[PDB]
Structure formats: C-alpha cells, structure tokens
Amino acid sequence: REEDAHSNLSSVRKKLDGEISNLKKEIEDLQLVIQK
Amino acid sequence: REEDAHSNLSSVRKKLDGEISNLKKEIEDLQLVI
Known part of the structure; x- marks a missing residue:
C-alpha cells in the first residue's frame, strides 16, 4: 500500500x-519584459 | 517509516x-490589465 501510495503522492x-x-x-x- | 513519510509528503x-x-x-x- 504505502510504496504505491508514496509513489502516487510523489508523482503528484x-x-x-x-x-x-x-x-x-x-x-x-x-x-x-516588464522592466522600464 | 512510511507513515511518517506519508506525513512528510502531505505537509510539503x-x-x-x-x-x-x-x-x-x-x-x-x-x-x-493587458
């Protein structure tokens, strides 16, 4: 659970x-661009 | 480990x-304004 859950989170x-x-x-x- | 890491992730x-x-x-x- 928490390896895949760590991966799901870390990919987010x-x-x-x-x-x-x-x-x-x-x-x-x-x-x-803005600087004047 | 991975639950405190679950917290370390969710905090960040x-x-x-x-x-x-x-x-x-x-x-x-x-x-x-453009």
Whole structure:
C-alpha cells in the first residue's frame, strides 16, 4: 500500500514542483519584459 | 517509516498547494490589465 501510495503522492508532487518552477521562472522572464 | 513519510509528503504537499495558488492568483490578477 504505502510504496504505491508514496509513489502516487510523489508523482503528484512531481506535477506540483514542476508547475511552481515554471511559475517562478516565467515570472522572471515576464519581469525582464516588464522592466522600464 | 512510511507513515511518517506519508506525513512528510502531505505537509510539503499542503505547502505546495498553498504556494502554487499564491503565484497562480497574482499572475491571473496581473494579466487582467493587458
């Protein structure tokens, strides 16, 4: 149960960590466009 | 081990859901001026 449950969770975490990194990064790009 | 790890995961997971939604909110609000 809890190996697969650890995997199910950690794969969700792999989506959650991925998005959050695209979010922090695409903000940086966006601000480099914004800067005036 | 794996139950405390279940907690170590779900705590971080809740910290993720939180921080994801902060960032996602602000972006979505900000886009509304373009």
